[PDB]
Amino acid sequence: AIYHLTAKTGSGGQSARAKADYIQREGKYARDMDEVLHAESGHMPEFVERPADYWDAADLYERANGRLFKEVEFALPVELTLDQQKALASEFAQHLTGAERLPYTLAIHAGGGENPHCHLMISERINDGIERPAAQWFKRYNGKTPEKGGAQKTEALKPKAWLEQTREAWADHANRALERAGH
Ligand SMILES: [Mn+2]
Ligand SMILES: [Mn+2]
Ligand SMILES: [Mn+2]
């Protein structure tokens, strides 16, 4: 079957922290988590103690005309069990952020019960393993001396072909998961 996937960037009055708290049902929404079946983040730099700490910095330090994150949304196969959905979502997140270790946060939602879906926000900053304070992470990159500037930005999510290529990738992933699940 077809599992539609869409995507958009957040710079108008978009707040990374608010978005992260909403999809994970954290913070103010801590008293309404039934909609969240799973949540996970990855590739977070050392200064981050909690995923939200990364989004807080992004909101407090990224320049106005900067890309706070790329939000991706995709439906999950209903036949799959929750564990199978968890593995699939994680697997696909790695597919999009694993090469360049782009920090990300994803959450799986129980759309009613007939429409399970996944929200995934990707930070377009390359984690090179070099420690940088929160106030320095989003500064401009310094090619000559990486440790003295911000994390380098990635252009991998900007190409025009990226959307359909991601859809084809998601399809290949969902399909693969379905067959080895018996379906
Ligand atoms: Mn892959
Ligand atoms: Mn990884
Ligand atoms: Mn949702």
Q: What does this entry show, briefly?
A:
By secondary structure, the chain is an alpha+beta fold.
Helix content: 25-40%
CATH architecture: 2-Layer Sandwich
Q: State the name of the first-level CATH class.
A: Alpha Beta
What separation lies between the terminal Cα atoms?
11 Å
Count of the domains: 1
Q: What form results from the Cα inertia axes?
A: globular
Order of helix and strand elements from N to C terminus: EHEHEHEEHH
CATH topology: BirA Bifunctional Protein, domain 2
What is the beta-strand fraction?
15-25%
Ions and ligands: manganese (II) ion
| Structural class estimated from helices and strands | alpha+beta
Tally the helices.
Answer: 5
Rg, alpha carbons: 17 Å
In total, how many beta strands? 5
Give the neighbour order of strands across the main sheet.
1-3-5-4-2
Biggest sheet features: 5 strands, antiparallel
